[PDB]
């Protein structure tokens, strides 16, 4: 059996780490698993028949310090409405905006949302939009283990209620949210440590009913290939 196939078994739940930044400062972090995915809200609640586990972005303090930009943050949060939904279906992650804040996204590095090429897209309203495909990710991960390419990116960054900060410091944006499917973070780290020699290393997939896997480098690379053979490509 291929333990990595658990990633795509129908009804499996991934863990998503949500980290929010107000003007470049981390203000919130929560890890969420839910069959419905997650939904970023300002808890100006709200509709309980909306889909997705509600993830409430914190109201900034009423402080005199930073009152200007924080009042703008509060305004953005107050206009989130139904919010920003993110969920998985098969090998794809999907997003939809359910309120009035135009939201732009990119798949980027963990520590930098805007590497210079602009957003990958705008999150649609009234229909779903694909924001991540596991297929190319695993292909690129295999290439990475073979010393033939960069580590594949998996951090979804959302710029909420403003234009994407192309050629502008991202820390000036009012509300930036990073979502990391922690299985993908784990898969990349497993590739990094495995290239170091070739004994056994442990990978934790951080998905429902998962158990930490102790694998050799050859075992790991073999499972990635078998996984990719059963996935969909254009």
């Amino acid at each position: 059996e291929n333990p990595l196939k658990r990633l795509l078994v129908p009804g499996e739940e991934w863990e998503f780490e949500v980290t929010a930044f107000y003007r470049g400062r981390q203000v919130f972090q929560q890890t969420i698993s839910c069959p419905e995915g997650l939904r970023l809200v300002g808890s100006e609640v709200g509709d309980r028949t909306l889909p997705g586990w509600p993830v409430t972005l914190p109201d900034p303090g009423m402080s005199l310090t930073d009152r200007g930009v924080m009042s703008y943050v509060r305004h953005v949060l107050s206009c989130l409405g139904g919010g920003l939904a993110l969920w998985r279906a098969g090998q794809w992650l999907w997003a939809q905006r359910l309120g009035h804040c135009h939201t732009y996204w990119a798949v980027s590095e963990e520590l930098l949302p805007n590497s210079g090429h602009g957003p990958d897209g705008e999150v649609p309203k009234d229909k779903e939009g694909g924001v991540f495909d596991l297929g190319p990710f695993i292909v690129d991960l295999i290439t990475f283990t073979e010393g033939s390419g960069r580590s594949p990116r998996y951090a979804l960054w959302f710029c909420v209620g403003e234009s994407w900060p192309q050629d502008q410091p991202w820390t000036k944006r009012l509300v930036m949210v990073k979502v990391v499917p922690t299985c993908l973070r784990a898969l990349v780290e497993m590739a990094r440590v495995g290239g170091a020699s070739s004994l056994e290393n442990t990978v934790d997939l951080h998905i429902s009913n998962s158990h930490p896997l102790s694998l050799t480098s050859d075992q790991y690379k073999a499972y990635l290939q078998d996984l990719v053979e059963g996935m969909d490509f254009q």
Partner: peptide, 14 residues
């Protein structure tokens, strides 16, 4: 500045 935030803001109306 407030002018820059106002310019970059993208929130549609009800």
């Amino acid at each position: 500045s407030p002018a820059s935030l106002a310019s970059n803001l993208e929130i549609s109306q009800s």
